[PDB]
Structure formats: structure tokens, C-alpha cells
Amino acid sequence: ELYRAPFPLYALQVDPSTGLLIAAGGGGAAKTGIKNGVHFLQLELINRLSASLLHSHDTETRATMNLALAGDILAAGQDAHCQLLRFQAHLELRVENLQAVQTDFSSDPLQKVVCFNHDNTLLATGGTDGYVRVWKVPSLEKVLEFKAHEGEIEDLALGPDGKLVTVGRDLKASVWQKDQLVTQLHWQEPTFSSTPYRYQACRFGQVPDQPAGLRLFTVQIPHKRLRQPPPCYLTAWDGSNFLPLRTKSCGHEVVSCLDVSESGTFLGLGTVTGSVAIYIAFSLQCLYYVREAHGIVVTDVAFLPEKGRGPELLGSHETALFSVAVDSRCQLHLLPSR
């Protein structure tokens, strides 16, 4: 393992400019110290890539369940709230709290996903109540609010030219312009189909050097767990036209997380069983798979950035995926050179 935190990990971000690995989680059973927080780790090449705790930011009783990063600002989902933090280096790290706002309002509320728009002027959130809410940054003035799904929101993504994709437990995947529905994705719709599929993740990526480059990547999983579970699928969509270009089965292990490299070249997957995979995004070809790399659900994955401090750390290797899990561990996954 690269790092073992004092609590189960739920979310990961890698800052290209500072070279910091930001791992967040909670629900840790510990007498004194810390049960919930965000840990900032300095990545340093040594003799071999290595991680080291720089700053431990305590979140009191609130487990950080998701993260988004925008320059020096970190947005952190905690219970039914989104908290903002500013972080800067000097090696010391100064971490200021900024505003927070409640983003979910069910009878058992929880924020499930957060991300920025491109210019980091807006923040979009989604949770158990089915409402997408959009907030100005850093003021957290609410600018939009609308019902996106009839159940919990599982993921969302702000794409280029303003488009928002959302996926819920209501089996629908919806594409929005502000609060207006542009279209839905209809992949999900035989007679003896043992289970319907639901979309579990959604990410835009811009595949570099490709003229038909703009993509939306989704993951579909069986809605019901079955004795023999059917496979999960990874689907590449045209990012502008929303046509399904390629659908690849990606195993019977339930996919728990997706990430696209900053470049748009690579996809990372984690599963409920703790497995980790790297795919080539243009063709959905698996480059790397390790079964049960963790003991338990992989909660998030994140590539080493191709810009900033990343290249120096990567060395001869082609890319690096970090994974985190409920086992409180952060693993490194290196692709071979060339």
C-alpha cells in the first residue's frame, strides 16, 4: 500500500500544481485522535513513488463522502452538506474553511456527488432527494434547483458547452441544459430480462489527437443483485450527439467508481469486491486489471495528472492510478513503460 489512513476512505483527488494526494473519509473507530477527515499527502519519488502525510484536516463527526477540486479550492460532501476549503503550500500546508451549504433534503439525507463546471464558477451537487442544485463559487449562492430523478442521484458530470449529465436509481440517464432536459440516454430499454440495468457512473472526456474526440463515458450495472449477476457494461457515447459508440462488458463484479484521466486517454474502474482496472478510453480496451486489490469496495479512483508536478513523479511509467477503499488504504497502480 501507498498509505493507510486512520479511517475508511471514500474519496480521492490529486492536485497537479502542488503534487498533493488528497484522501478523504471517515467512520473510524478510534478512542483519541480522528474519526473523520481529509488527509493531504506529499508525493515524493524516493530510491520508487512514495506518499507521506503532510496535513490532517479534521471534519469533527462528519464523514467526507465525496470531493471535487478546482484550483486551490476543495469541495467536500459531508453528511447532507457541501463544505468548501482553500488550501495552499508554505513544507507547511495552510487549509482555511470557507462556506458550507446543505444540498440534500430527504428524511435520511446525504450528498452523493459534487463537481465544478470548467471555469470553477459553478458547483453542481446531487443526493438522495433527486434534486440537482447548482451553486456559485465561492459564495454558495444557489442558482439552480430542479428534480432530476425520482430516486437518489448516483452520479453527475458537467461537460463542455454547459451540458449536465445525471444518473439515478430511477434507471434514467438525463442530459440537461441549465434546468431544461435536452435528451435522455436510452441504452437501458428482452422479454425474459432477469433485471433492468441502471446507470451507476457518468464522465465526460476529451480524447486527445482524435478528430471525433468528445466523449461521455457511462457505466451500467444490474439494478437488482442476482444469484448469477449479469455483467456490468462500460459505454462510450458521442459527447455532443449522445449516440452509443461502444459498449464493452467489464465483468460481473459490481462497478463502484469511474474516473477519466486529465488527458482523456485513460479510464479507471473500481469494484465492490475491491478490484481495479485501467482501460484505454478511445477503444474501451483493458490495459490493466487486478482482482481484489483491496479487501472491500473501492470507493474512488484517480489518475496521476499528466500536467504539473505529476510527470516528474511518474518517471518512465505510462500512467498511474490511485485507488482508495473502505479498508482505509490507498494503493498505487502503475502501467508499464512504452
From Swiss-Prot:
The modification 3'-nitrotyrosine is found at residue 3. Ubiquitous. GO terms for molecular function: DNA binding; GTPase binding; guanyl-nucleotide exchange factor activity. It is a single-pass membrane protein. WD repeats lie at residues 1-43, 50-89, 91-137, 141-178, 184-239, 243-281, 286-337. It comes from the Eukaryota. It is found in: Endoplasmic reticulum membrane; Nucleus. Its main location: endoplasmic reticulum. Residues 1-338 are cytoplasmic. GO terms for cellular component: endoplasmic reticulum exit site; endoplasmic reticulum membrane; membrane; nucleus. PROSITE patterns: WD_REPEATS_2, WD_REPEATS_REGION. InterPro entries: Quinoprotein_ADH-like_sf, Sec12-like, WD40/YVTN_repeat-like_dom_sf, WD40_rpt. GO terms for biological process: COPII vesicle coating; endoplasmic reticulum to Golgi vesicle-mediated transport; lipoprotein transport; regulation of COPII vesicle coating. Keywords: Activator, DNA-binding, Endoplasmic reticulum, ER-Golgi transport, Membrane, Nitration, Nucleus, Protein transport, Repeat, Transcription, Transcription regulation, Transmembrane, Transmembrane helix, Transport, WD repeat. Pfam families: WD40 (PF00400). The keyword Transmembrane applies. Gene3D superfamilies: YVTN repeat-like/Quinoprotein amine dehydrogenase (2.130.10.10). Guanine nucleotide exchange factor (GEF) that regulates the assembly of the coat protein complex II/COPII in endoplasmic reticulum (ER) to Golgi vesicle-mediated transport. Selectively activates SAR1A and SAR1B by promoting the exchange of guanosine diphosphate (GDP) for guanosine triphosphate (GTP) in these small GTPases. Was first identified based on its probable role in the regulation of pituitary gene transcription. Binds to the prolactin gene (PRL) promoter and seems to activate transcription. Interacts with SAR1B (GDP-bound form). Interacts with MIA2; recruits PREB to endoplasmic reticulum exit sites. Interacts with CIDEB; facilitating loading of SCAP-SREBP into COPII vesicles. This is Guanine nucleotide-exchange factor SEC12. The lineage of its organism: Eukaryota, Metazoa, Chordata, Craniata, Vertebrata.
